């Protein structure tokens, strides 16, 4: 498990997820260029996101994630830990 | 309305977009000399793309724009609208 | 070497360098609580300063690198190298 | 200007501080309850520090300011005045 802090910018935080029903993981899915989370060097496409400001995101439907993350707070903190067996299942 | 239809080249397709979060609107941010987009002549810094072969992206955020638009296949068929107002607020 | 990107916040960058002459390094001194460098987790008191936004510290004084610092824009990029030693050195 | 003397318990001085950039000014934001600050009595939270054991944080950012306070000696000598409306516009920025 990993921690990674990332400022939003007009712009958003740089990445997109992916995710399917509740419980099958929430994972980030591409990171755009010259965004936050790409500047900050750390968040990776096979990232299963675990907790949004301590939002638990375990249980959570890709939908759910989407407004959380897009809701969450100015310095927002990411807990994730890389499942690329996970990310690589999710697709389809 | 205008429609504009770029090949994509090992280069990309020649321009770098711009947007906000959802609803905020797409933009084409710069275009490179040489690149499929100004050697089709058509596409210009304030035109909103409204769709991606099809894709929609009145709603889309910046990063999924990105997104989209850097996987879109063969004739990319651009839906674009020039709006300098807008541009020039995103940039604020 | 290390990269830490950190965004300045109106409180600063969230520590304090210290350094000596001309060549003797720049060596974060502090991080406060709460500030982009600790929330960030990644800077640390031991770490020398190589770089900031690609200006090169090696040569730098303490007043200049603190006034390149203080200066430097919004997306701050650091690349540091943790140096207990010269750090402790410095004294 | 008001002064203030505050010891050092292990639990610090019994108050939080902002600040800004250089010049900007030190201000208490916070006074833990049960702190040395509260049971003092005298810091309140639009207090600027001019001064703490002498050392000046006038020209102070808030990450020298809380370095200076975090370090100062046992009996920790305050000169502070109190500043609402530099309070108030630090915290709009």
């Known amino acids: 498990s990993r921690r ?3 400022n939003r910018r007009p712009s958003g ?6 995710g399917g029903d509740n419980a099958q993981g929430i994972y980030v899915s591409f990171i755009s260029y010259g965004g936050p989370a790409e500047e900050d060097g ?7 996101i675990l907790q949004v400001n301590s939002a638990d995101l ?3 439907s890709h939908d759910e994630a989407v407004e959380i993350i897009k809701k969450a707070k100015s310095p927002v903190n990411l807990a994730v ?3 690329p067996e996970g990310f690589g299942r999710l697709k389809s």
Chains 1, 2 share one sequence.
């Open 58 to 60: 375990s249980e959570a």
């Open 4 to 6: 990674i802090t990332l």
């Open 13 to 18: 935080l740089g990445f997109n997820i992916v």
């Open 81 to 83: 830990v890389h499942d």
């Open 42 to 48: 750390r968040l990776q496409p096979g990232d299963k």
